Amino acid sequence: IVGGTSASAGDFPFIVSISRNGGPWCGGSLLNANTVLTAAHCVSGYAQSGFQIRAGSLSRTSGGITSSLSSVRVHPSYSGNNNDLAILKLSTSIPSGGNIGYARLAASGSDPVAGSSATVAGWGATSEGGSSTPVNLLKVTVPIVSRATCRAQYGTSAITNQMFCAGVSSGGKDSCQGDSGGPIVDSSNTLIGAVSWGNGCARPNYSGVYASVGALRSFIDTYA
């Protein structure tokens, strides 16, 4: 997260950190005791044994409850930047309670409205290419950017109806490498997306791009 602040205990109770080969990798969202939602690009094409999830901690290295993966399912239309969600099943179930909870999902057919406030969180870099990544969770609030404006930034075909955008026109606030897969929520604390892609991080005139939970809700509901 670039331009963020420290998360407090009990913020994002459903967030999980996802390590790969013992090192930082991505974020995700705990949907229920045995299921995590993340970005497809975090897991597609990699050995599933490399991953570990951690829930219930501000730290990505220590505390909370961990689990390995039992299975990985990517959206059936996932390709590159498009349809960038995956469902992970956990080898060890994780109960709600204390600083762990489960996400509430945006409805099928919904689309975040331009200008509304969203909050994204993760353990990614705080600069493009950053040499070290924070141990404790960060968060930042950014406005939704209309799909039309985002298409003017990236190209008409580049931003699909299963993506939405968020950021500040002058830059300075965004998700960044290592935040992929983690949650973005709306002003009701409903999970509206997962960190997906962008041109660099927090650049002026290049919004962060998010996989849309509303748009992909049928997939999520099938496998959750």
- State the CATH number of the domain containing residue 87: 2.40.10.10
Q: Is the domain of 8 the same as that of 22?
A: no
Of 2, 5, 1, 26, the C-alpha closest to 16 is 26
Q: Is the domain of 123 the same as that of 196?
A: yes
Q: Is the domain of 107 the same as that of 97?
A: no
Q: Is the domain of 8 the same as that of 116?
A: yes
Beta bridge partners of 72: 88
Give me 98's structure tokens: 């204390």
The span from the CA of 119 to the CA of 165, in Å, is: 12
Burial code (b: 16+ CB inside 10 Å, e: under 16) for 16-36 equals: bbbbeeeebbbbbbbbeebbb
> Residue 187's domain spans which residues?
1-12+103-214
How many structural domains does the chain have?
A: 2
The span from the CA of 73 to the CA of 33, in Å, is: 17
Specify the amino acid at residue 182.
G
Quote the DSSP letter at residue 9: T
The span from the CA of 207 to the CA of 202, in Å, is: 7
Dihedral over Cα of 64, 96, 28, 128: its sign = negative
**Resolution of the entry in angstroms:** 0.8
Query: Who's near 122: CB < 8 A, 6+ residues apart?
Result: 1, 15, 27, 137, 138, 175, 178, 179, 182, 195
The span from the CA of 195 to the CA of 212, in Å, is: 9
Q: Are 209 and 176 in contact (CB under 8 A)?
A: no
Residue 131 CB-half CA count within 13 A: 0
The span from the CA of 158 to the CA of 22, in Å, is: 33
Residues labelled catalytic: 41, 84, 180
Beta bridge partners of 29: 15, 37
Q: What is the side-by-side strand order in the sheet with 86-90? A: 65-67, 51-55, 15-20, 23-32, 35-38, 86-90, 69-74
Give me 215's structure tokens: 């748009």
Of 1, 158, 188, 181, the C-alpha closest to 74 is 181
Q: What are the φ and ψ backbone dihedral angles of 154, each rounded to 5 degrees?
A: -105, -20
Q: Are 149 and 165 in contact (CB under 8 A)?
A: yes
Give me 219's structure tokens: 């997939």
In 33-80, which ranges are E strands?
A: 35-38, 51-55, 65-67, 69-74
Q: Is the domain of 125 the same as that of 138?
A: yes
Q: Is the domain of 207 the same as that of 114?
A: yes
In 129-190, which ranges are E strands?
A: 138-145, 163-166, 183-185
Q: Are 150 and 55 in contact (CB under 8 A)?
A: no
Q: What is the residue whose two structure tokens read 């409205």? A: 113
The span from the CA of 56 to the CA of 217, in Å, is: 25
Beta bridge partners of 69: 90
Burial code (b: 16+ CB inside 10 Å, e: under 16) for 136-149 equals: ebbbbebbbbbbeb
Beta bridge partners of 6: 138
Give me 204's structure tokens: 């002026």
Of 132, 129, 88, the C-alpha closest to 220 is 88
Give me 220's structure tokens: 């999520």
Q: How was this structure determined?
A: X-ray
Q: Is the domain of 132 the same as that of 84?
A: no
β-strand pairing of 191-197 with 69-74:
unpaired
Overall size of the chain counted in residues: 224
